């Protein structure tokens, strides 16, 4: 994961158009989210507690990724419990 | 919720066949689960932390209900994160 993000950011800085820069930054975001999906597969609640560890590894892009993963998983749970009611 | 469970247990003790007893005990279980679905709609993580409060209100039947709700929601999350990987 970490090595893949560095290559993506190596490509984003090399780029001179905002389309390519955003493309590679989104590749980096999606790679980080894959790391979080694996942690949440084993323990979703611990995932919601590891925001600090993700920020240490991935910086602000890690915050962005964590926020999206967390948000989409609570939207799934919301829909789930509305159905059960 | 609490009043509905008491009526269900009023019916279960009045019954003399194990089919009716189990039916009313399951009605009580399902009513308790409706209370938990509403708490988890607002905050699923707090739901996983309220086991003690459910036991105080509903006793062993509350433990049974909490265990089923918790188990089925982690099975949903497991399937969810497997898809995302």
Alpha-carbon gap: B16 to the closest alpha carbon of chain A (Å) = 31
Look at A34 and B82 and tell me if their CB atoms are within 8 Å: no
Contact call for residues A69 and A54 (beta carbons, < 8 A): no
Q: What is the DSSP string of B7-23?
A: HHHHHHHH--SHHHHHH
Mutant choice from A44, A48, A69 vs B, greatest count of B C-beta within 10 A? A44
Number of separate helices (H) and strands (E) present in chain A: 4, 0
From first CA to last CA, the distance across chain B in angstroms is 39
Chain B residues within 8 Å of chain A (Cβ atoms):
33-34, 37-38, 40-41, 44-45, 48, 73-74, 76-78, 80-82, 84-85
Report the alpha-carbon distance of residue B5 to residue B36 in Å, rounded: 14
Look at A44 and B84 and tell me if their CB atoms are within 8 Å: no
Contact call for residues B47 and B71 (beta carbons, < 8 A): no
Contact call for residues A29 and A61 (beta carbons, < 8 A): yes
Candidates A41, A44, A78; nearest CB to B85: A41
**Residue A2 DSSP symbol:** H
Report the alpha-carbon distance of residue B12 to residue A18 in Å, rounded: 69
Look at B82 and A41 and tell me if their CB atoms are within 8 Å: yes
Mutant choice from B33, B43, B82, B84 vs A, greatest count of A C-beta within 10 A? B84
State which approach was used to obtain the coordinates: X-ray
Residue B46 to residues A5, A28, A76, B42, B63, Cα–Cα distance (Å): 34, 32, 16, 9, 16
Angle (CA) B17-B22-B28 rounded to 5° is 135
Report the alpha-carbon distance of residue A67 to residue A48 in Å, rounded: 10
């Amino acid at each position: 994961h970490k090595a893949r993000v560095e290559e993506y950011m190596r490509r984003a800085l090399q780029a001179t158009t905002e389309p390519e820069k955003k493309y590679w930054e989104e590749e980096a975001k999606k790679e980080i989210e894959q790391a979080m999906y694996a942690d949440a597969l084993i323990n979703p609640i611990r995932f919601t507690e590891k925001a600090a560890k993700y920020i240490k590894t991935y910086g602000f892009r890690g915050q962005e990724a964590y926020d999206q993963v967390k948000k989409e998983m609570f939207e799934k749970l919301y829909k789930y419990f509305m159905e059960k009611l």
